[PDB]
Design an enzyme around this catalytic site. Structure first.
Site, PDB file in Angstrom:
ATOM      1  N   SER A  18       0.709  -1.352  -0.022  1.00 28.67           N
ATOM      2  CA  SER A  18      -0.002   0.073   0.027  1.00 28.67           C
ATOM      3  C   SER A  18       0.814   1.136  -0.045  1.00 28.67           C
ATOM      4  CB  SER A  18      -0.863  -0.012   1.229  1.00 28.67           C
ATOM      5  OG  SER A  18      -1.721   1.045   1.080  1.00 28.67           O
ATOM      6  N   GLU A 180      15.624  13.722  12.783  1.00 26.55           N
ATOM      7  CA  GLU A 180      14.259  14.178  13.203  1.00 26.55           C
ATOM      8  C   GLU A 180      14.041  13.480  14.762  1.00 26.55           C
ATOM      9  OE1 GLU A 180      11.783  12.234  10.157  1.00 26.55           O
ATOM     10  OE2 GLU A 180      12.683  13.527   8.615  1.00 26.55           O
ATOM     11  N   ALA A 329      10.745   8.982  -1.021  1.00 27.11           N
ATOM     12  CA  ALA A 329       9.367   8.809  -1.429  1.00 27.11           C
ATOM     13  C   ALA A 329       9.076   9.187  -3.051  1.00 27.11           C
ATOM     14  CB  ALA A 329       8.286   9.692  -0.705  1.00 27.11           C
TER      15      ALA A 329
HETATM   16  C1  LIG Z   1      10.590   7.658   9.504  1.00 29.39           C
HETATM   17  C2  LIG Z   1      10.658   8.044   8.042  1.00 29.39           C
HETATM   18  C3  LIG Z   1      10.890   9.158   7.608  1.00 29.39           C
HETATM   19  C4  LIG Z   1      11.081   9.451   6.148  1.00 29.39           C
HETATM   20  N1  LIG Z   1      11.047  10.755   5.548  1.00 29.39           N
HETATM   21  C5  LIG Z   1      11.207  11.045   4.404  1.00 29.39           C
HETATM   22  C6  LIG Z   1      11.481  12.263   3.787  1.00 29.39           C
HETATM   23  O1  LIG Z   1      11.334  13.420   4.537  1.00 29.39           O
HETATM   24  N2  LIG Z   1      11.349  12.524   2.610  1.00 29.39           N
HETATM   25  C7  LIG Z   1      11.423  11.463   1.842  1.00 29.39           C
HETATM   26  O2  LIG Z   1      11.555  11.516   0.480  1.00 29.39           O
HETATM   27  N3  LIG Z   1      11.615  10.225   2.198  1.00 29.39           N
HETATM   28  C8  LIG Z   1      11.403   9.874   3.431  1.00 29.39           C
HETATM   29  N4  LIG Z   1      11.261   8.470   3.995  1.00 29.39           N
HETATM   30  C9  LIG Z   1      11.414   7.532   2.759  1.00 29.39           C
HETATM   31  C10 LIG Z   1      10.027   7.131   2.351  1.00 29.39           C
HETATM   32  O3  LIG Z   1       9.093   6.730   3.527  1.00 29.39           O
HETATM   33  C11 LIG Z   1      10.113   5.733   1.491  1.00 29.39           C
HETATM   34  O4  LIG Z   1      11.240   6.147   0.501  1.00 29.39           O
HETATM   35  C12 LIG Z   1       8.913   5.434   0.681  1.00 29.39           C
HETATM   36  O5  LIG Z   1       7.974   5.436   1.754  1.00 29.39           O
HETATM   37  C13 LIG Z   1       9.203   4.226   0.221  1.00 29.39           C
HETATM   38  O6  LIG Z   1       7.982   3.815  -0.290  1.00 29.39           O
HETATM   39  P1  LIG Z   1       7.597   2.160  -0.796  1.00 29.39           P
HETATM   40  O7  LIG Z   1       6.312   2.025  -1.679  1.00 29.39           O
HETATM   41  O8  LIG Z   1       8.718   1.674  -1.591  1.00 29.39           O
HETATM   42  O9  LIG Z   1       7.532   1.402   0.419  1.00 29.39           O
HETATM   43  P2  LIG Z   1       6.616   1.550   1.597  1.00 29.39           P
HETATM   44  O10 LIG Z   1       5.343   2.816   1.185  1.00 29.39           O
HETATM   45  O11 LIG Z   1       7.357   2.171   2.724  1.00 29.39           O
HETATM   46  O12 LIG Z   1       5.893   0.253   2.193  1.00 29.39           O
HETATM   47  C14 LIG Z   1       5.112  -0.599   1.103  1.00 29.39           C
HETATM   48  C15 LIG Z   1       3.968  -1.095   1.419  1.00 29.39           C
HETATM   49  O13 LIG Z   1       3.993  -2.454   1.508  1.00 29.39           O
HETATM   50  C16 LIG Z   1       3.518  -3.224   2.555  1.00 29.39           C
HETATM   51  N5  LIG Z   1       4.131  -4.489   2.688  1.00 29.39           N
HETATM   52  C17 LIG Z   1       5.552  -4.756   3.072  1.00 29.39           C
HETATM   53  N6  LIG Z   1       5.786  -6.000   2.948  1.00 29.39           N
HETATM   54  C18 LIG Z   1       4.799  -6.500   2.653  1.00 29.39           C
HETATM   55  C19 LIG Z   1       4.388  -7.774   2.277  1.00 29.39           C
HETATM   56  N7  LIG Z   1       5.351  -8.731   2.625  1.00 29.39           N
HETATM   57  N8  LIG Z   1       3.094  -8.206   1.836  1.00 29.39           N
HETATM   58  C20 LIG Z   1       2.210  -7.163   1.804  1.00 29.39           C
HETATM   59  N9  LIG Z   1       2.531  -5.935   2.011  1.00 29.39           N
HETATM   60  C21 LIG Z   1       3.905  -5.707   2.275  1.00 29.39           C
HETATM   61  C22 LIG Z   1       3.641  -2.255   3.785  1.00 29.39           C
HETATM   62  O14 LIG Z   1       2.972  -2.643   4.803  1.00 29.39           O
HETATM   63  C23 LIG Z   1       3.484  -0.875   2.961  1.00 29.39           C
HETATM   64  O15 LIG Z   1       2.272  -0.460   3.255  1.00 29.39           O
HETATM   65  C24 LIG Z   1      11.060   8.409   5.489  1.00 29.39           C
HETATM   66  C25 LIG Z   1      11.103   7.003   5.796  1.00 29.39           C
HETATM   67  C26 LIG Z   1      10.747   7.023   7.123  1.00 29.39           C
HETATM   68  C27 LIG Z   1      10.779   5.313   7.536  1.00 29.39           C
END
Ligand SMILES: Cc1cc2nc3c(=O)[nH]c(=O)nc-3n(C[C@H](O)[C@H](O)[C@H](O)COP(=O)(O)OP(=O)(O)OC[C@H]3O[C@@H](n4cnc5c(N)ncnc54)[C@H](O)[C@@H]3O)c2cc1C
Ligand SMILES: Cc1cc2nc3c(=O)[nH]c(=O)nc-3n(C[C@H](O)[C@H](O)[C@H](O)COP(=O)(O)OP(=O)(O)OC[C@H]3O[C@@H](n4cnc5c(N)ncnc54)[C@H](O)[C@@H]3O)c2cc1C
Lengths: 447, 447
Positions: A18, A180, A329
């Site tokens: 998600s 942070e 992100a």
């Molecule tokens: C505390 C924090 C602060 C941050 N601040 C910043 C910022 O200021 N600026 C910035 O650019 N980036 C920031 N980031 C980084 C940013 O959050 C990530 O780069 C971004 O969220 C990556 O998204 P994603 O879709 O790749 O994975 P995510 O969105 O992190 O996760 C993917 C989704 O898949 C789900 N999932 C995982 N494993 C499974 C599984 N086995 N089966 C089913 N579902 C699963 C998870 O629950 C989640 O909902 C921050 C990260 C953190 C932790």
């Protein structure tokens, strides 16, 4: 097992996670003539860049975790499904997932894997018993519970040495998340809790920031790193650099300095944010496709984000080791949009004879450090302080979902930064310790 | 053990519990020549009358559970202390309490006991695994998690009979809390979740309200009971009165009704709200003093709310079986204010030769049942529907703490009642199941 989803005759897209990548691919397919299953470990699209604000009491969950089911309400192509994906089959083209003891095997014709990544203990995984990694709302509410509960315990403890242990808050890792948290824990100690305690004085609390890196915010380069460190030190955060963690106990951290000297920080509340490691799924892909992994296990996808030999299977966001693309992100958003646009373009009557590689358009990057201070870099422009902090707030507020959510966020910021009150100081012993209690009892039950 | 608090030479008042009676006694002593310790199981003053809005996603916890430490910030004679009070000694004038395995023994010269009461399973407390009772933020978030997670499971489940089990929500007890929850679960299924699903239609969900009482809201008389029932039935809540629960399972409830017939309500999600039982502390008092207990275990305090033979130990709020005083927040507020005024009057040497008995001033009572409908009784006048609901909202809004809290709750009501979106549909598996999974693993570990 049965597929646990609605079937269709049209082209079937499964999206795992998600996240920014998964939800952006789903939104992109809103009219793409595909049947979309989105499978996620949780019901909500966590806006993680504000997670430290819920972990330190500024805003509530509903500001940052809208239900993904409700975001996609009007999108008739999409079915949101809850479930932990436990296995992916590339030969039978199924995703196998578990929900409260029921196992489902959803078929796919194209697959977008956006499971992302977590922080990493570099193999000392048992440190997780003592230094939680903030990556989910369960973690954020655990950190809030441990942080405020340390002051609540210190208020009663007669022993000065135990109070010194309790009021030393240790944050590991000097990436954005660690700066942070060290900032907000310092402001929480010396501004919000000011005068709320009769035996201790919270302003005496120590906040220690540990990293093995030689500079704060390595991604920002030297100048913004030193600017952020200067702000942290001005807040009395004791930034310690070149310190490698070697052991962790309920009582503290043992660190080795870059000179090789070994020393110990007594510290009850600990926060882990160092390193990264892709979701475990990467290994299931690696053994099936032969795609290789980096250290941290991120999938070294092909230039079109596909797996070798599986041109309909994409990995996007933090799970993908795309060359030159940072784990941010915007990298997930752009990767998911790219993969979903490839799907849309190939399921339509159009067909590029070859795909154009993924291009990441770097929008720049920012990190907040304190009330009225942040650092930002945007191509050739490097700037810091109050204006960078306003830009950080505005940029992140733009991504929140729903107008009322933005208004209530903006009110919570208004009060928390003009005044010093905080709204979400609720904590509970269950939220603070259930993960520990359960893992301990499971280790007993394994006997 | 040592005392877990600062020492003082002046008269020492200990207050147990952060709720209405305890916090009201603390705020009343703000100018008395006394030193106040307030000992509470949790850090927050939980405004329970809006707890169901947390349990059904309308408002965040920080809107109803301000940290009691922060409320008393300016009261320099009050020390807030976290701790589960494990024992009260009436002879050694001491209160023994536990915090993360540390045990403290705080002396007192006067004691106000405001530990309140929970719901009751009568003899069958093993039901508590299957039918959570909503009494804490931990319970409100558990109910939210298990309610939303029932639709989240039903969306995947291929078996129609399992879906019928999942989408039948059973609320036990037809007091205020039960009517509130049945109403909100009905609105949640019918309005907020409408169209957010693809395999199920949430509007097919059944909401069942069970009580052994012959009328809804027994406290409010037949007329308002009938109007509340008629509103619930018009919402499609299947009110089943005269039904006594005989067994509860993971799968459902078996009830015996006033006709003597046995029937089973297959139902995954249960909510318990029937009965009352006072805090277990009542036994310690009934062992140490000749005080009687109700069947509910509530302490039959003397006319000045004291224990027999302990003129300086008071019980207030739901824990006290005061004749003619209902178990409502105004009974706690008035009892705590009375006890604290007695202390203030006697410590200052302004003591009368005889204390005037406690007089409860009945401000009337109200119960919400739905969006745009409630019932209210105010002495001779009884009224219902929209104006009763608007008055109920205004009245309960006035008790919240902080002006931002009132704005943000008013915005959350504005959205939730004019639109149909809800801000706080965030749930997690840990919030939904940690309590049971811990008790199950402790039952293994007891082997
Ligand atoms: C505390 C924090 C602060 C941050 N601040 C910043 C910022 O200021 N600026 C910035 O650019 N980036 C920031 N980031 C980084 C940013 O959050 C990530 O780069 C971004 O969220 C990556 O998204 P994603 O879709 O790749 O994975 P995510 O969105 O992190 O996760 C993917 C989704 O898949 C789900 N999932 C995982 N494993 C499974 C599984 N086995 N089966 C089913 N579902 C699963 C998870 O629950 C989640 O909902 C921050 C990260 C953190 C932790
Ligand atoms: C769902 C629901 C709906 C309600 N609706 C209404 C309504 O419409 N109108 C109304 O007037 N009231 C309502 N109430 C309030 C309720 O009916 C009581 O009137 C009120 O809660 C009494 O408050 P109290 O002073 O007893 O403190 P409580 O609210 O009972 O709080 C007790 C406090 O003592 C603490 N405590 C308990 N045991 C211990 C221990 N062993 N050691 C230390 N601390 C301890 C608890 O943590 C808590 O802080 C509602 C309550 C609920 C749960």
């Amino acid at each position: 097992s049965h597929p646990g989803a609605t079937a269709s005759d049209r082209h079937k897209v499964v999206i795992i996670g998600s996240g920014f990548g998964g939800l952006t691919a789903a939104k992109t397919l809103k009219r793409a003539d595909v049947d979309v299953k989105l499978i996620a470990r949780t019901t909500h699209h966590l806006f993680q860049p504000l997670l430290y604000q819920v972990a330190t009491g500024i805003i509530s969950e509903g500001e940052i975790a809208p239900a993904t089911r409700v975001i996609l309400r009007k999108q008739k192509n999409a079915q949101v499904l809850l479930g932990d994906v436990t296995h992916i089959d590339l030969e039978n083209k199924t995703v196998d997932s578990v929900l409260l003891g029921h196992t489902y095997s959803t078929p796919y014709d194209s697959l977008i894997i956006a499971a992302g990544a977590g922080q990493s203990y570099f193999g000392n995984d048992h440190f997780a018993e003592f230094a939680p990694g903030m990556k989910s709302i369960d973690d954020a509410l655990e950190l809030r519970g441990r942080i405020l509960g340390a002051f609540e315990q210190a208020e009663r403890s007669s022993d000065p040495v135990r109070r010194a242990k309790l009021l030393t808050f240790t944050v590991v890792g000097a990436g954005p998340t660690g700066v942070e948290m060290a900032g907000q824990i310092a402001e929480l100690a010396d501004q919000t809790l000011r005068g709320s305690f009769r035996h201790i004085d919270p302003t005496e609390a120590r906040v220690i920031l540990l990293d093995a890196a030689p500079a704060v915010l390595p991604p920002m380069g030297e100048k913004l790193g030193k600017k952020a460190r200067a702000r942290l030190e001005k807040m009395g955060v004791e930034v310690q650099l070149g310190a490698m963690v070697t052991d962790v106990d309920r009582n503290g951290i043992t660190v080795k300095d870059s000179d090789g000297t070994i020393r110990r920080i007594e510290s009850a509340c600990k926060v882990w944010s160092a390193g990264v490691s892709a979701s475990p799924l990467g290994k299931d892909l690696a053994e099936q496709s032969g795609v290789e992994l980096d250290r941290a296990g991120r999938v070294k996808v092909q230039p079109d984000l596909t797996l070798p030999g599986h041109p309909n299977v994409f990995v996007v966001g933090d799970m993908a080791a795309v060359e030159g693309v940072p784990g941010v992100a915007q990298g997930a958003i752009q990767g998911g949009r790219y993969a979903a646009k490839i799907i849309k373009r190939e399921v339509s009557g159009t067909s590029p004879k070859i795909r154009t590689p993924f291009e990441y358009f770097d929008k720049g990057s920012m990190a907040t450090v304190s009330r009225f201070s942040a650092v930002a870099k945007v191509g050739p422009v490097e700037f810091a302080g109050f204006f960078a902090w306003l830009c950080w707030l505005v940029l992140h507020l733009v991504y929140l979902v729903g107008f009322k959510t933005k208004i209530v966020t903006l009110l919570s910021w208004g009060v928390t930064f003009l005044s010093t009150k905080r709204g979400q100081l609720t904590i509970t012993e269950q939220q603070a310790y259930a993960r520990t209690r359960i893992e301990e009892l499971e280790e007993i039950a394994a006997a």
